[PDB]
Each structure stands twice: as structure tokens, then as C-alpha cells.
Amino acid sequence: GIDPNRIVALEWLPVELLLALGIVPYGVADTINYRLWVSEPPLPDSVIDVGLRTEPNLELLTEMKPSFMVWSAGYGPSPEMLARIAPGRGFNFSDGKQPLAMARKSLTEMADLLNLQSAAETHLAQYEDFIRSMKPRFVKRGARPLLLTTLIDPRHMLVFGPNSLFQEILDEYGIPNAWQGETNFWGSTAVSIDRLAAYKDVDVLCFDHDNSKDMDALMATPLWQAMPFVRAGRFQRVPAVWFYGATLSAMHFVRVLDNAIG
């Protein structure tokens, strides 16, 4: 990916890989929603918005002449088509089981392409040290399971399972994941609100994403007010954290997790 000042990121996973290595993306797809869902690593104003991750402005990309383009494997435009625009590389979010293990491989992969091998090691070290250092902030709690969720719309809640980005973190902190049901490759699944009522005694965190009107609707239903974990006083709304990112999203999760139940 030769010129490090002309890299265009078409998905938020590799944006995060670039930022962790100190690169300032030349262009990034959907900067508007990035602010609502990822929020962290804010993107400098210089960054050029190249459209939706699913329908990027191909005209713009062509005019921009990126030195390299990065995206997420299995997501968005055809990689065969993108490769026709400029040199590029697709990155894997997971192997279907451990997203963070993949995140560490992707970071190394990206760094080798950009010859930032040292920057990647320093970061990976900062990452592993941070996760370990926070461990004692969750020694107090027991084995009460934790349910990680986010509201898609009043009728569907996403729940993050065993193969989600957050699992390795929960595992390291000795926090059982309340969700042991099915999940997609990305580590989540959408469930109707009633399915959440099955969780009598658990702590629940719900990541916000500028959806107060939606949350308001949900919390106004008799079902939500009847929710056992709600009445138990175990429900908490927390700030947005990208669930399909890498090491930066993982550390962002720990800070949010800390503030919520640390």
C-alpha cells in the first residue's frame, strides 16, 4: 500500500487498523455514521467521505486515485471490482470463533504492508498491557452473567454471543456471557424483546447509537417495564462501542465496561 497518505478505508474495521498504526486515512466510507457507531478514534476533518461502505462513490474513488484501498472480507462491494479501481486488501474480522485473535493478525498484516512493523508491536504491547491492567477492576463481581446488547429498532435487540469481539475480554475478566444461543459470523444475532425476559438474574448493558427515540419507545412498553432484569435494577445504557472492529474497539469496550460495572 505504498503511499501511506493515500489509503482509502471502505469499512470501519480496517479504519481502526490504520488508526492503530498511526495512519491518517485519505478517505473513509460513511464518516457520518462512523461518528454514531464507532465514535472513538474520531476521524480528522481532512478525511474525505467516500460514501456508504455498501455503495461507495466509485466515481470519487477513481478521481482520488488511492494508493491502496482496504475493506472487510465478505462485506460490501465485490473485491474483484474494487481491485479494478486501485490496489487493495480485504481484512478478516474473525475466523468465526475468535475476532480478537484475528484482530492481532490483521494489525500485523496491515503493518507489514505499510512497513510499520515496529508501530504494530508497540501497539499490540499497549493493548495486551491495558487489558491485563484492568483485570482487578472486575475482581469484586462474581459469576453473574452479563448480557451485551444494542437496540436495532423497537422490535429487535442485538445480543452478542461467544464468538463476538467482546467474548475474549469477558473471558479474561471471568465474566460469563449470558448469551449462549446462536450467532452469525460477526458474533451477534437479533432477538425479539420477549426473548430477553428469559434472563431473570443477569447484568445487561445496551450500547447507544444516537437512538434515544427508539429506546424511549422500547422502554415505554409494558414488556420492557416488566423485564425481570429491568425491575432488578440491572439494566444500563452505555456509550457506543463498535462491535465489529479490532483492538481499539476492544479497549474502548473495556473503558465502557469499567465505567458500567467496574
CATH at residue 3: 3.40.50.1980
The residues that bridge with 147 in the sheet, in sequence order, are 204
Task: Give 237's Cβ-side CA count (13 Å radius).
Answer: 11
The verdict on 63 and 113 lying in the same domain is: no
Task: Return d(Cα 21, Cα 118) in angstroms, integer.
Answer: 9
Q: Report whether 243 belongs to an annotated binding site.
A: yes
Residues whose CB falls within 8 Å of the CB of residue 163, separated by 6 or more in sequence, listed in order: 94, 96, 97, 98, 99, 183, 185, 187
Q: Report whether 12 belongs to an annotated binding site.
A: no
State how far the alpha carbon of 5 is from the alpha carbons of 23, 26, 68, 199, in Å: 7, 6, 10, 49
Direct distance between the N- and C-terminal alpha carbons of the chain, in angstroms, rounded to an integer: 41
Residue pair 23/4 in contact (Cβ under 8 Å)? The answer is yes
State how far the alpha carbon of 113 is from the alpha carbons of 26, 87, 109, 198, in Å: 16, 12, 6, 47
Experimental method: X-ray
**Residue that is written with C-alpha cell 491518517 in the block:** 24
Q: Report whether 71 belongs to an annotated binding site.
A: no
Q: Report whether 186 belongs to an annotated binding site.
A: yes
Q: Report whether 75 belongs to an annotated binding site.
A: yes
**91, 126, 154 — which closes off a domain?**
91
Phi, psi of 243 (to 5 degrees): -85, -10
Convert 132-141 to b/e letters by CB count within 10 Å (16 or more is b). Answer: eebeeebeee
**Residue that is written with C-alpha cell 409494558 in the block:** 222
Residue pair 7/67 in contact (Cβ under 8 Å)? The answer is yes
The verdict on 131 and 166 lying in the same domain is: yes
Counting other chains too, the contacts that 210-217 makes at CB distance below 8 Å and 24 or more residues apart are 210/36, 210/240, 211/151, 214/151, 214/153, 214/154, 215/151, 217/154
C-alpha grid cell, residue 197 = 425476559
Report which residue type is found at 76.
G
Q: Report whether 244 belongs to an annotated binding site.
A: yes
The verdict on 184 and 86 lying in the same domain is: no
Task: Return d(Cα 100, Cα 167) in angstroms, integer.
Answer: 9
Range of the domain at 258: 92-262
Q: Report whether 37 belongs to an annotated binding site.
A: yes
Task: Return d(Cα 150, Cα 232) in angstroms, integer.
Answer: 19
C-alpha grid cell, residue 260 = 458500567
Please tell me the total count of domains within the chain: 2
The verdict on 100 and 43 lying in the same domain is: no
The verdict on 85 and 119 lying in the same domain is: no
Residue pair 127/247 in contact (Cβ under 8 Å)? The answer is yes
The verdict on 150 and 54 lying in the same domain is: no
Q: Report whether 242 belongs to an annotated binding site.
A: yes
Residue pair 17/107 in contact (Cβ under 8 Å)? The answer is yes
**56, 91, 126 — which closes off a domain?**
91
Task: Return d(Cα 67, Cα 6) in angstroms, integer.
Answer: 5
